[PDB]
From Swiss-Prot, chain B:
Effect of residue 170 to A: Does not affect ability to repair double-strand breaks (DSBs). Does not affect interaction with XRCC4
Protein name: Non-homologous end-joining factor 1
List of residues that carry Phosphoserine: 133, 204
Effect listed in the UniProt record for changing residue 124 to R: In IMD124; likely pathogenic; abolished ability to repair double-strand breaks (DSBs); abolished ability to participate in V(D)J recombination
Species the sequence originates in: Homo sapiens (Human)
Effect caused by changing residue 65 to E: Abolished ability to repair double-strand breaks (DSBs). Abolished interaction with XRCC4. Abolished ability to participate in V(D)J recombination
PTM (free text): Phosphorylated by PRKDC at the C-terminus in response to DNA damage. Phosphorylations by PRKDC at the C-terminus of XRCC4 and NHEJ1/XLF are highly redundant and regulate ability of the XRCC4-NHEJ1/XLF subcomplex to bridge DNA. Phosphorylation does not prevent interaction with XRCC4 but disrupts ability to bridge DNA and promotes detachment from DNA.
Noted disease: Immunodeficiency 124, severe combined: A form of severe combined immunodeficiency (SCID), a genetically and clinically heterogeneous group of rare congenital disorders characterized by impairment of both humoral and cell-mediated immunity, leukopenia and low or absent antibody levels. Patients with SCID present in infancy with recurrent, persistent infections by opportunistic organisms. The common characteristic of all types of SCID is absence of T-cell-mediated cellular immunity due to a defect in T- cell development. Microphthalmia/coloboma 13: A form of colobomatous microphthalmia, a disorder of eye formation, ranging from small size of a single eye to complete bilateral absence of ocular tissues. Ocular abnormalities like coloboma, opacities of the cornea and lens, scaring of the retina and choroid, and other abnormalities may also be present. Ocular colobomas are a set of malformations resulting from abnormal morphogenesis of the optic cup and stalk, and the fusion of the fetal fissure (optic fissure).
Phenotypic consequence of residue 106 to S: Does not affect ability to repair double-strand breaks (DSBs). Does not affect interaction with XRCC4
Consequence the record notes for mutating residue 120 to A: Abolished ability to participate in V(D)J recombination
Expressed in which tissues: Ubiquitously expressed.
Gene that this polypeptide is encoded by: NHEJ1
Swiss-Prot/TrEMBL GO biological process terms: B cell differentiation; central nervous system development; double-strand break repair via nonhomologous end joining; immunoglobulin V(D)J recombination; positive regulation of ligase activity; response to ionizing radiation; T cell differentiation; telomere maintenance
Effect seen on changing residue 42 to A: Does not affect ability to participate in V(D)J recombination
Length: 81, 235
C-alpha cells in the first residue's frame, strides 16, 4: 500500500511539474507543496514519529486499528489451503 | 556474558538459508565467548545459546584432529556464517543440512577451512514462549502499526497535493500534456480496490523470502526501540 501511495504521489508530482511548465500561477502561494522524496520521508518518519507509532502497549491498538487486514489475510490463508 | 549474547541476538536482522531444497529463517550472533542462534521455518522456532564450555567438547568431537581454542573456532564459525546470511548468491564452499528426530533440530554446517574439514552441529531445542514473543510477535505488531501510520501520512500528503491540483485547475490553466490527468484520491476507494484486486498476491508469505527482502530496516528499528555649630554671623 505504501509503495502504491508513493507511485500515486510521483504521478501527481509529474502533473504539478507539467502544470508549472505551462506557466500557471497559483492564486494562493501558501498551497505550494514541496516535492516528495521517498528516502527523505522515510528517514524523517523513522527519526520523529516511529518511537510513538511503534508502541504495542497492552494490545489495544492492535484490535483498534488492524483488525480488518488481519481478517482478510486469514481468509486468504484459508482459501489457499 | 549471557545477557550480552541475548542483546546481540535481539539487535540482529533475519537471514535466509537454503538447505536441501528447504528454506529457513536464521538469526545468529557469535562473540568471542559463545554464540546465540534462532532458527525458524514459519511453523516452529528453535533457539540455541552456547558457551565456551560446550564448544571445547563439540569442536573436538566433531573435528577429532582439530587443535583450536574456543576463540579461534568461534571466529572461524562467524567468518563462515556472516557472508552467507548478509547476502545471498555469494559463492562459498559451505554446506548446510537440516534434520529433526523427535523434537530437536540438528543443523549441520560442513565447510572447507582453507582445505581442511570444519564441521559444526547446532542442536536447537524449542524456543520458549518468551523468546518467540520477544523476537517475532511484538516486533511484527510494531511494524504493522508503523506502516499504518506511514499510510496515513501518505494519504495526508496526497490530500494536500489534491488541494494544490484543485487550486491549479481553478486558476484556469491547461496542461500541455493531457495524459497526466489523475482522478482525485479517495482512501476508501483505494482500500477497497486494493483488497479486491491485489491483497491475494501481496499477502502471500511464501517461504519467508519476501519478509527478509522487504521489511528489515523497520524491524531493526522497532527492535532497537523496544530494547532501549554655626551661630552668629554664619546663621
Amino acid at each position: 500500500q505504501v509503495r502504491e501511495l508513493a507511485t500515486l504521489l510521483h504521478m501527481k508530482d509529474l502533473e504539478i511539474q507539467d502544470y508549472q511548465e505551462s506557466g500557471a500561477t497559483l492564486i494562493r502561494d501558501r498551497l505550494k507543496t514541496e516535492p516528495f522524496e521517498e528516502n527523505s520521508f522515510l528517514e524523517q518518519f523513522m527519526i520523529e514519529k516511529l518511537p510513538e507509532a511503534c508502541s504495542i502497549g497492552d494490545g489495544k491498538p492492535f484490535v483498534m486499528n488492524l483488525q480488518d487486514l488481519y481478517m482478510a489475510v486469514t481468509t486468504q490463508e484459508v482459501q489457499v489451503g | 556474558v549471557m545477557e550480552e549474547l541475548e542483546q546481540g541476538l535481539l539487535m540482529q536482522p533475519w537471514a535466509w538459508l537454503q538447505l536441501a531444497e528447504n528454506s529457513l529463517l536464521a538469526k545468529v550472533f557469535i562473540t568471542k565467548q559463545g554464540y546465540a542462534l534462532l532458527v525458524s521455518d514459519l511453523q516452529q522456532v528453535w533457539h540455541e545459546q552456547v558457551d565456551t564450555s560446550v564448544v571445547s567438547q563439540r569442536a573436538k568431537e566433531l573435528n577429532k584432529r582439530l587443535t583450536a581454542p574456543p576463540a579461534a573456532f568461534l571466529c572461524h564459525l562467524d567468518n563462515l556464517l556472516r557472508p552467507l546470511l548478509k547476502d545471498a548468491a555469494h559463492p562459498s564452499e559451505a554446506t548446510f543440512s537440516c534434520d529433526c528426530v523427535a523434537d530437536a533440530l540438528i543443523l549441520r554446517v560442513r565447510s572447507e577451512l582453507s582445505g581442511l574439514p570444519f564441521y559444526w552441529n547446532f542442536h536447537c531445542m524449542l524456543a520458549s514462549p518468551s523468546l518467540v514473543s520477544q523476537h517475532l510477535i511484538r516486533p511484527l505488531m510494531g511494524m504493522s502499526l508503523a506502516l499504518q501510520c506511514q499510510v496515513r501520512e501518505l494519504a495526508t500528503l496526497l490530500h494536500m497535493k489534491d488541494l494544490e491540483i484543485q487550486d491549479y485547475q481553478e486558476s484556469g490553466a491547461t496542461l500541455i500534456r493531457d495524459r497526466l490527468k489523475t482522478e482525485p484520491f479517495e482512501e476508501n476507494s483505494f482500500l477497497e480496490q486494493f483488497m479486491i484486486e491485489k491483497l491475494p498476491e501481496a499477502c502471500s508469505i511464501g517461504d519467508g523470502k519476501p519478509f527478509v527482502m522487504n521489511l528489515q530496516d523497520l524491524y531493526m528499528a522497532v527492535t532497537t526501540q523496544e530494547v532501549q555649630k554655626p551661630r552668629g554671623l554664619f546663621s
